[PDB]
């Protein structure tokens, strides 16, 4: 019972990995850069091979560098939940976002928004002057969202505090 856009995409998968139903970051990149690099009322050159790479590693629980079609859906969906917010806050069509409207799109993506964390975002995905393109905007949320979950996972009971050994650390941190 999946939408028509997923069906066509679904078809695009088997034509790549076949029964293996998997895509690579690169594969995922074009598969994505052709659906969003469409409708002009939204500007971008396309997702860079790094953005996808996090999309993939963040959804990967077997460390193989591949995106399952089901896990794909989850992401894609979220992508669309946000291919909105951004499109709504970038009116300049310059393909960026207001330095003081940034705090506006991230609340429209439902987040706790803390001062310290903010900066981090700003220093990592924005341009020299302080502007974030579609790419990095979406690329941010995946990864962000991921950690909100990774934390939810590592914390079974609810002591609002996870705890990791170094290997656990370098892993969480390195595969993103």
């Amino acid at each position: 019972n999946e939408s028509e856009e997923v069906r066509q995409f679904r078809r695009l998968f088997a034509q790549l990995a076949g029964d293996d139903m998997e895509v690579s970051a690169t594969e995922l990149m074009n598969i994505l850069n052709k659906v969003v690099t469409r409708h002009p009322d939204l500007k971008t050159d396309g997702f860079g091979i790094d953005t996808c790479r996090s999309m993939v590693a963040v959804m990967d629980s077997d460390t193989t560098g591949k995106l399952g079609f089901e896990e794909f859906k989850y992401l894609w969906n979220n992508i669309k939940r946000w291919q909105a917010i951004y499109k709504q806050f970038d009116t300049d069509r310059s393909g960026t976002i207001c330095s003081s409207e940034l705090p506006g799109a991230f609340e429209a993506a439902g987040f706790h928004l803390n001062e310290h964390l903010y900066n981090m975002i700003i220093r990592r995905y924005s341009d020299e002057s302080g502007n974030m393109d579609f790419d990095n905007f979406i690329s941010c949320l995946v990864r962000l969202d991921a950690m909100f979950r990774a934390f939810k996972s590592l914390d079974k009971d609810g002591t609002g505090q996870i705890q990791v050994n170094i290997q656990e650390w370098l892993q969480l941190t390195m595969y993103s």
Binding site: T63, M147, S153, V164, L172
Partner: protein
């Protein structure tokens, strides 16, 4: 999904999860739950996971549309019998049988269970019935690639003219059978997938033991002084023939007529009746029987008895990520030493001998039992005079072997029989060719205590920690600094990016992406500014200098591209050592589809690693081995 998952299941699997006691709950379904949440509702379970539609039956063959499955009656026991029992006592015979559609390896596999009631206690949770708390749902435990999974299923069975098309009893009443079979079909994803499967397989699934098998046609010298030991251990033995009946080897003593010494074989039949021309057997059975399979068992099976010699055991897990940990085969010495490596140390000997098997975990690809399997195999090497060291190319380029598995098969699980001089032996599981994405489990049934570990490194990072204080500049460089920035005379991620790129004209390549810079900085910006002064910029420049020496010292061309397998070496040069798992994350998160790491990413990594390290190191000022954090604080590091 994400590492977080594959990582939280570890702490959980490390606690109990998987073992019989705490077996996993396939598709996250609770018997108690659903059961309870079905009686109170006044309903009968309805597997939303494995519905009683056509697709549960099969795909192509027992596939929908097809007549094999067209027109079908999913009826529950009740709807077709009267006072259906789940399981009653322990007969002397079975009464089991397959319907039209059913396969036939279930007949043998199930049978055995029947005639060893405690083995069946592991699979079927004898504690179900159609009268006390019936909701139309039962459950079973099945062993899979090293750990027990628990499946919940409803009793809608596929009939047609009141006839059960798969596994059932001749005499109605009992159904544990047809259900444990509906179950197994579920875990395997559908009935049609059982279509084939080895008696040798589904049986390990039902017990957890290890199935070794022999061709009676041309058997081994010690063929005999084993079965004895077999039964002697508690294992179970079967035997088929090109007639199409599966038997059991219930025992065999070499009775001596003091003049002949006529050893015998006590074959048995599950279904009861027995008749023939010969004797037990004149051991002229080798000329009569075609196949023999002995299934040694996981020792916690017979939780009691103190009858039968109990094996010893230890199992481990491993993977083979393409372009990184996927060498496989002595033949490819360019990767082979890259496989996972485990230590097995034998103490005292027999009066050592050990069973070793390499079974290979499921893979999306595969839809039917037996199909889509990789060609695994495995070699074991003699330890000269030594763990924390992942055996290098040298060690194997040297020592030739010391008995390597008897071939690489195209099949799930691979075992061999060994007996050795109480020394430490190393073994390298792996696939045939190289680059074969997949996972595995290596179990080991010995005779006396065994210490199974792994040859690999540990997170170990120790870089050069310079303490130049705005000096140690050589000035030639100092001079050549401020003049690159301008006013404030500091650098910024982006400033660093152009600045840096504008520093090349030696050799694809094109300076670094900002992300890199972005983190170059991040690994040094302590004051929390967003810029760098002479000191740090110096460290950088020099660090780069180092880094670059290695990519080149290995990219012995003008490609600006290095094989992923290099990266392990590499990291060692840069002073980083890590176990198999990370390198994978390192190649997974950093290589190309062709398995090439450009120079930028090469360093984006080295840098990032060092940062995350330091942050970790710094935050664990005492060296406890753990760095506690709440959400917020986590989310900060988290974003790179």
């Amino acid at each position: 999904a994400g590492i977080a998952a594959k990582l939280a299941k570890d702490r959980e699997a490390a606690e109990g999860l998987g073992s019989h006691e705490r077996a996993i709950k396939y598709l996250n379904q609770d018997y108690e739950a659903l059961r309870n949440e079905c009686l109170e509702a006044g309903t009968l379970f309805q597997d939303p996971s494995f519905p009683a539609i056509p697709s549960a039956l099969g795909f192509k063959e027992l596939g929908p549309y097809s007549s094999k499955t067209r027109g079908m009656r999913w009826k529950r026991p009740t709807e077709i019998c009267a006072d259906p029992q789940f399981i009653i006592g322990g007969a002397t015979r079975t009464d089991i049988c397959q319907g039209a559609l059913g396969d036939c390896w279930l007949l043998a596999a199930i049978a055995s269970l029947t005639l060893n009631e405690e083995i069946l206690a592991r699979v079927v949770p004898l504690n179900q019935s159609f009268q006390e708390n019936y909701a139309g749902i039962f459950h079973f435990q099945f062993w899979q690639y090293g750990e027990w999974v628990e499946v919940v299923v409803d009793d809608r069975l596929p009939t047609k003219d009141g006839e059960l098309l798969f596994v059932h009893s001749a005499e109605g009443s009992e159904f544990w059978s047809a259900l444990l079979e509906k179950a197994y079909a579920k875990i395997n994803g559908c009935y049609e997938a059982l279509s084939g499967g080895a008696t040798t397989e589904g049986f390990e699934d039902f017990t957890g033991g290890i199935a070794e098998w022999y061709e009676l046609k041309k058997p081994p010298p010690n063929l005999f002084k084993i079965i004895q030991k077999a039964l002697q251990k508690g294992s179970l033995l079967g035997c088929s023939i090109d007639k199409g009946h599966a038997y059991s080897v219930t025992g065999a003593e070499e009775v001596e007529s003091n003049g002949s010494l006529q050893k015998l074989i006590r074959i048995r039949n599950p279904w009861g009746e027995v008749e023939w021309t010969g004797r037990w057997m004149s051991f002229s059975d080798f000329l009569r029987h075609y196949s023999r399979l002995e299934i040694c068992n996981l020792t916690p099976d017979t939780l009691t008895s103190d009858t039968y010699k109990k094996w010893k055991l230890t199992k481990m897990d491993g993977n083979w990520r393409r372009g990184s940990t996927a060498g496989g085969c002595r033949n490819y010495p360019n990767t082979f030493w890259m496989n996972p490596q485990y230590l097995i140390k034998l103490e005292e000997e027999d009066e050592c001998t050990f069973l070793v098997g390499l079974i290979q975990k499921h893979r999306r690809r595969q839809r039917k039992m037996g199909e889509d399997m990789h060609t695994i195999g495995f070699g074991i090497y003699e330890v000269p005079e030594e763990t924390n060291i992942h055996l290098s190319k040298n060690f194997f380029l040297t020592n030739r072997a010391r008995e390597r598995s008897d071939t690489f098969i195209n099949l799930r699980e691979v075992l061999n029989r060994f007996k050795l001089p109480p020394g430490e032996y190393i073994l390298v599981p792996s696939t045939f060719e190289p680059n074969k994405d997949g996972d595995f489990c290596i179990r080991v049934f010995s005779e006396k205590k065994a210490d199974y570990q792994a040859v690999d490194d540990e997170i170990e990072a120790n870089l050069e920690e310079f303490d130049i204080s705005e000096d140690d500049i050589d000035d030639g460089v100092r001079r050549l600094f401020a003049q690159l920035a301008g006013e404030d005379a500091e650098i910024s991620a982006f400033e660093l990016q152009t600045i840096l790129r504008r520093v090349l004209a030696k050799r694809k390549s094109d300076g670094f992406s900002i992300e890199t810079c972005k983190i170059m900085v991040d690994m040094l910006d302590s004051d929390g500014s967003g810029k760098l002064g002479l000191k740090e910029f110096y460290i950088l420049w020099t660090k780069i200098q180092k880094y670059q020496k290695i990519y080149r010292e290995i990219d012995v061309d003008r490609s600006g591209t290095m094989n992923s397998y290099e990266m392990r070496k590499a990291l060692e040069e840069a002073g980083f050592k890590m176990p198999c798992q990370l390198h994978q994350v390192i190649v997974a998160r950093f290589a190309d589809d062709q398995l090439i790491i450009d120079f930028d990413n090469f360093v984006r990594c080295l840098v990032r690693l060092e940062t995350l390290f330091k942050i970790f190191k710094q935050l664990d000022p005492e060296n406890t081995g753990t760095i506690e954090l709440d959400l917020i604080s986590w989310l900060c590091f988290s974003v790179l």
